[PDB]
Design a binder for this molecule. Structure first.
Ligand code: NDP
Ligand code: NDP
Ligand code: A1L44
Ligand code: A1L44
Ligand code: CA
Ligand code: CA
Ligand code: CA
Ligand code: MN
Ligand code: MN
Lengths: 408, 408
């Protein structure tokens, strides 16, 4: 009866939100068993989680805090977890028959490795890490075609919204990333909603001057805050939409909805549009990823639409947010351009965060790396294709850094 | 896999809209066969439709234009339709094995009769007539339990919206007008959107003196236009929601949404809200009733959310729109109070339309009729129950009229 879940990246924003909603859902019935928690190096925070949830498995990626973990955990009475470390630990958890569903709340390109292994073990993968899809979309499709019982269920709020708007009667006959998913689901077009970020109303002159402090001062982590400010977050999410739902780029429309109530919309072939809405929230997306195709009761505050009162929609200016255009261009180009987009953005975003370049330099760097990249034949076997993605990702990060280094 | 459809009330608003969307859809691919048309007295319109759609059956209710119809139809080359008459024509159409779905576009209290025979013959019934559901909900539920393969599919725009927000793998485990429909679909709450009609900004003093002219001068029939002005249309729709979807009255919220883009919204038990949105429209509601659980291509204009730009929501004032409160009160009392509400409103609406009473007299009369009713032993026998509904309807109409005449 209980859904057996692993939380990968349990100490971060997604991971802690997941454990919060699991905690609430488990107050009376045993709805979920938390079988495994995996983090990078937050050994103290992991220990506190282990004390509460008592998972069968604990894993730390950073082997240097393994002893520290082992020692902390001995303090917990009558608890004999399997304590693992690194890639080998990740792979052992993914292999466990006692795990059904894995929440991937690991950030950056790193989250791809666990995603890949979770699919290879025919698990349900509740994927929040959009960089994996953007970097490796075609590769994940291939894997999902081999590993017949694996599924990716989207957790990113807009993709969760789109997924929810679908009719599960059609969803159940396909799965995310599968060729023909949009046909089977009668999808015509997607309205991909965005907050628009902190700089949405600035003039071109004002935008030239913006700093990371101006973006940082809805409270989110730094990387995503900067991506929201440039709208590269939405750019990545366009490519994410295309891969998840097999929707053509020309049928994905970015819409700025600053109230952030409507989380995205699907237009079906009859032109009817379905949308999903709630307060800005990750608990519903995470919960749904674990309960789908069912829903369960929560005690979340009900949406008060009369109090919200007003919902607004407008088209983003691609002159002001050129990251959006770069994302569409890379996605349409296909091949490894999305990998290059993501990698170069990782560098450009961090340069801006750290006050080393200007706002328009972010898109300039990314553009230059994209223009520099030469298309490669797509390796035909899975393990060569993975190595290739890694090659290009690293190449693009280095190229971005080289561009920055040369031009100051 | 052609969809075989009969249109009942084919020359009316619903009927003609149904043929319109069938016509447009069939231009894209021939999915619909119109097998039967049925009208009251519009023999010439009927002839013209018969010319286009070449239905196997034709039926007119009023015996006195039967021969005229037979005459008219002779003109049509290479066409030998079965031409039928009255209550008896309807019964034969509903019994045909070549008809899968019947659109009931017959208005007022009348529409119940053909609904019943459509259900008795295990058809899919596309039902727009909210008054039948409000007045005879308990009878329809009983019929639908006897006739296991019959289904009512809602066409009323808000109810179609609600229905379209659901997962059909769960819908297919139940059917509308069944107990536990909302439980099985994990429905928590409904937002029932309303235009708000022409009087939302009027003061109490202004409402005291509004006339039917002010109500009438979005173009619809007179009766529904007056109901939209008083918001008794929404009150009837609250009860319609309760019966169609088994949603408790305290879990239906009327919200004024004057732009009429979001057609209504379903809050699930996790507090996720899904909504259906389009331009104000009856084509998609009708078409979906006929395609459910699938959708097909249309050439309808795509919603341009950016252009719509702004969507607003507010709570209706019950002091200004007391008909809403009366509908909830009747719904919550249950029994035959909905039958009484509907019947007395039929009279009060017509009184106001004909300048015989004032705006607040509408709710006054309805209130007084409801107060004079006493709950009745609900017959377990289908035949006795229909007679109860007819008797109570007629009683309530006479009572409303008596209250009008006494004060006037
Ligand atoms: N937060 C949100 O609301 C949203 C998140 N997302 C996406 O979800 C992903 C995760 O985001 P978020 O929760 O914000 O990220 P955080 O930075 O808050 O958390 C990252 C988590 O991953 C762990 N981690 C990092 N590297 C490894 C590794 N090698 N092995 C195991 N665990 C590791 C961290 O461990 P430690 O604590 O030890 O560092 C931490 O638990 C991102 O791709 C993000 O874009 C998208 C939509 C919304
Ligand atoms: N369309 C809309 O926007 C909305 C409609 N509705 C509901 O839909 C229902 C239908 O409304 P609408 O189509 O606008 O109404 P109309 O008055 O425009 O249509 C009436 C139709 O019923 C036919 N009819 C009447 N009596 C008989 C009979 N005894 N036998 C056969 N046919 C008969 C009429 O035939 P004839 O032409 O010969 O008189 C005509 O075809 C209403 O109950 C309303 O509440 C709900 C919400 C909005
Ligand atoms: C504290 C908190 C909690 C939950 C959420 C849910 C939105 C999460 N999400 O999917 C994201 O991609 C974040 C970035 C995007 C966004 C979306 C909504 C609000 C603000 C920003 P955008 O790229 O549109 O600017 C947000 C903020
Ligand atoms: C010609 C045409 C065609 C389609 C529509 C769309 C839906 C109509 N519908 O279901 C009704 O109940 C009508 C009355 C209600 C309404 C709803 C939307 C717009 C305007 C009015 P309300 O009770 O909320 O005032 C409208 C007008
Ligand atoms: Ca150490
Ligand atoms: Ca759904
Ligand atoms: Ca297309
Ligand atoms: Mn997102
Ligand atoms: Mn309606």
């Amino acid at each position: 009866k209980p859904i057996n879940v692993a939380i990968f990246g349990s100490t971060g924003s997604i991971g802690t939100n997941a454990l919060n909603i699991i905690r609430e859902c488990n107050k009376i019935e045993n709805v979920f068993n938390v079988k495994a928690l995996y983090v990078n190096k937050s050994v103290n925070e992991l220990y506190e989680q282990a004390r509460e949830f008592l998972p069968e498995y604990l894993c730390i990626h950073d082997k240097s805090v393994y002893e520290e973990l082992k020692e902390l955990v001995k303090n917990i009475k009558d608890y004999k977890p399997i304590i693992l470390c690194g890639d080998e630990g990740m792979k052992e958890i993914c292999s466990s028959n006692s795990i059904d569903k894995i929440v991937i709340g690991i950030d950056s390109f790193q989250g791809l490795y666990s995603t890949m292994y979770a699919i290879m073990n025919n698990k349900i993968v509740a994927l929040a890490n959009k960089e994996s899809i953007v970097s490796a979309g075609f590769f994940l499709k291939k894997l999902l075609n081999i590993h017949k019982n694996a599924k990716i269920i989207p957790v990113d709020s807009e993709h969760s919204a789109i997924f929810q708007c679908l009719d599960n009667n059609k969803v159940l006959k396909t799965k995310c990333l599968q060729d023909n998913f949009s046909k089977i689901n009668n999808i015509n077009k997607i309205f991909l909603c965005s907050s628009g970020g902190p700089f949405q109303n600035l003039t071109m002159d004002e935008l030239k001057n913006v700093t990371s402090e101006n973006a940082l001062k809805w409270k989110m982590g730094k990387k995503i805050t900067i991506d929201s400010a440039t709208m590269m977050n939405k750019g990545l999410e366009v490519i994410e939409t295309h891969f998840l739902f097999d929707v053509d780029y020309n049928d994905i429309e970015v819409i700025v909805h600053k109230e952030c109530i409507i989380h995205s919309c699907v237009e079906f072939i009859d032109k009817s549009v379905i949308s999903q809405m709630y307060y800005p929230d990750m608990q519903i997306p995470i919960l749904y990823s674990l309960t789908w195709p069912d829903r369960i009761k929560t005690n979340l505050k009900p949406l008060d639409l009369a109090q919200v009162s007003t919902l607004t929609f407008h088209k983003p200016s691609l002159e002001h947010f050129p990251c959006i255009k770069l994302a569409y261009q890379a996605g349409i180009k296909g091949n490894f351009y999305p990998t290059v987009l993501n990698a170069s953005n990782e560098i450009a975003n961090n340069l801006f965060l750290n006050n080393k370049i200007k706002y328009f330099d972010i898109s300039s760097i990314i553009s230059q790396v994209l223009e520099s990249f030469n298309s490669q034949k797509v390796s035909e076997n899975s393990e060569d294709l993975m190595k290739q993605i890694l090659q290009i990702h690293s190449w693009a990060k280095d190229k971005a850094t080289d561009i920055y280094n040369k031009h100051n």
